[PDB]
């Protein structure tokens, strides 16, 4: 019952899927939400990116 | 393509096919950009 | 403009009117000797 940090493999990976089942695999999954993490520990400003 | 034109006769004559394709895919917009112009 | 992260970016082109505008041309200076008063200030009146 505790927060932990785990490299972003699966998320990623389950949205790509969604995005194929829900458009067509031609739209690039860019704007999509990563249902169920809390934090980053890690924040980057326009610069950064 | 797919015509006497891409398969000439030498080609033919080894046994094959070329059926050249060309597609023009879509691209994501990355960058949106307006203006706001001032106009009389 | 720069562009080298993905966003919205909203700029003013400065293309339009900027209109000229007149001067007033009714302002004298009159230089001369007074009894009292201050010296050598170029004092500003607008009513006697």
Same mark, same amino acid.
């Given at each position: 019952?505790?927060?932990? *940090?785990?490299?972003?493999?699966?998320?990623?990976?389950?949205?790509?899927?969604?995005?194929?089942?829900?458009?067509?695999?031609?739209?690039?999954?860019?704007?999509?939400?990563?249902?169920?993490?809390?934090?980053?520990? *890690?924040?980057?400003?326009?610069?950064?990116? | 393509?797919? %015509?006497?034109?891409?398969?000439?006769?030498?080609?033919? %004559?080894?046994?094959?096919?070329?059926?050249?394709?060309?597609?023009?895919?879509?691209?994501?917009?990355?960058?949106?950009?307006?203006?706001?112009?001032?106009?009389? | 403009?720069?562009?080298?992260?993905?966003?919205?970016?909203?700029?003013?082109?400065?293309?339009?009117?900027?209109?000229?505008?007149?001067?007033?041309?009714?302002?004298?200076?009159?230089?001369?000797?007074?009894?009292?008063?201050?010296?050598?200030?170029?004092?500003?009146?607008?009513?006697?």
């Amino acid at each position: 019952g505790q927060s932990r *940090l785990v490299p972003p493999s699966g998320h990623v990976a389950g949205i790509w899927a969604r995005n194929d089942s829900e458009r067509g695999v031609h739209k690039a999954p860019a704007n999509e939400v990563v249902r169920g993490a809390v934090d980053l520990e *890690l924040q980057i400003t326009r610069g950064e990116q | 393509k797919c %015509d006497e034109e891409t398969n000439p006769p030498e080609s033919v %004559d080894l046994g094959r096919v070329v059926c050249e394709i060309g597609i023009a895919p879509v691209k994501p917009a990355e960058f949106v950009i307006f203006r706001l112009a001032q106009f009389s | 403009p720069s562009y080298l992260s993905p966003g919205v970016y909203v700029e003013e082109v400065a293309s339009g009117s900027r209109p000229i505008e007149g001067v007033g041309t009714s302002v004298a200076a009159f230089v001369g000797l007074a009894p009292t008063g201050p010296l050598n200030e170029p004092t500003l009146v607008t009513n006697w």
